[PDB]
Design a protein around this ligand. Structure first.
Ligand SMILES: O[C@@H]1[C@@H](O)[C@H](O)OC[C@H]1O
Length: 207
């Protein structure tokens, strides 16, 4: 249950993933349910996550209401994100709902709107990745973001509310590939202890 190199699997009912490119190091310890701990040092790009991977046949509406209750002790040294993350396919989209970050509030673009949800106010952004690694090969795809205005590291993220706000703004979503509580680092080091992470789909916790 010690993962220090790329790996995709299921642990205690959650689909876990460790992903990095070359350079630096990371260690992910898979703990009960949706929980896990992460440590990274001098990485180029690293992601740690536990959630649900889907079979690419359903819209988020078809999957149902998605909500994540979480808690994490997040200690980044540099650029890193504490978020809900995932992808859609057809179209291929990488998405983020960011509740905390390190020294840099992402994602560097001009906001396209705002959403109020879960007692916070999030700025909404759309960015473009060109010929970058993805879940479907080296590709050019959009990234969708909701970024909280101030940091928090525990609470509930009403994931489906963000998806409806994005679609309201014309940020087209495809079939669901994944939704997961994620820690991402970029050119940084840090630690994160995700001590609470429950994904409920139509109110039912994952198992
Ligand atoms: O799962 C990995 C993704 O999250 C990362 O961003 O880049 C490529 C994918 O394989």
């Amino acid at each position: 249950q010690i993962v220090t190199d790329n790996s995709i699997g299921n642990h205690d009912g959650y689909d876990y993933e460790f992903w990095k490119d070359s350079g630096g190091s990371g260690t992910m310890i898979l703990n009960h349910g949706g929980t896990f701990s992460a440590q990274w040092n001098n990485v180029n790009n690293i992601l740690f996550r536990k959630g649900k991977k889907f079979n690419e046949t359903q819209t988020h509406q078809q999957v149902g209401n998605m909500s994540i209750n979480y808690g994490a002790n997040f200690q980044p040294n540099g650029n890193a994100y504490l978020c809900v993350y995932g992808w859609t396919v057809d179209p291929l989209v990488e998405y983020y709902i960011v509740d905390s970050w390190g020294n840099w509030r992402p994602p560097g673009a001009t906001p396209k709107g705002t959403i109020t949800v879960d007692g916070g106010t999030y700025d909404i952004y759309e960015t473009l990745r060109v010929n970058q690694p993805s879940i479907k090969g080296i590709a050019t795809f959009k990234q969708y973001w909701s970024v909280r205005r101030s940091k928090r590291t525990s609470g509930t993220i009403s994931v489906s509310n963000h998806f409806r706000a994005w679609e309201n703004l014309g940020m087209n979503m495809g079939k669901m590939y994944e939704v997961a509580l994620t820690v991402e680092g970029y050119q940084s080091s840090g630690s994160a202890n995700v001590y609470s992470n429950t994904l409920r789909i139509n109110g039912n916790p994952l198992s």
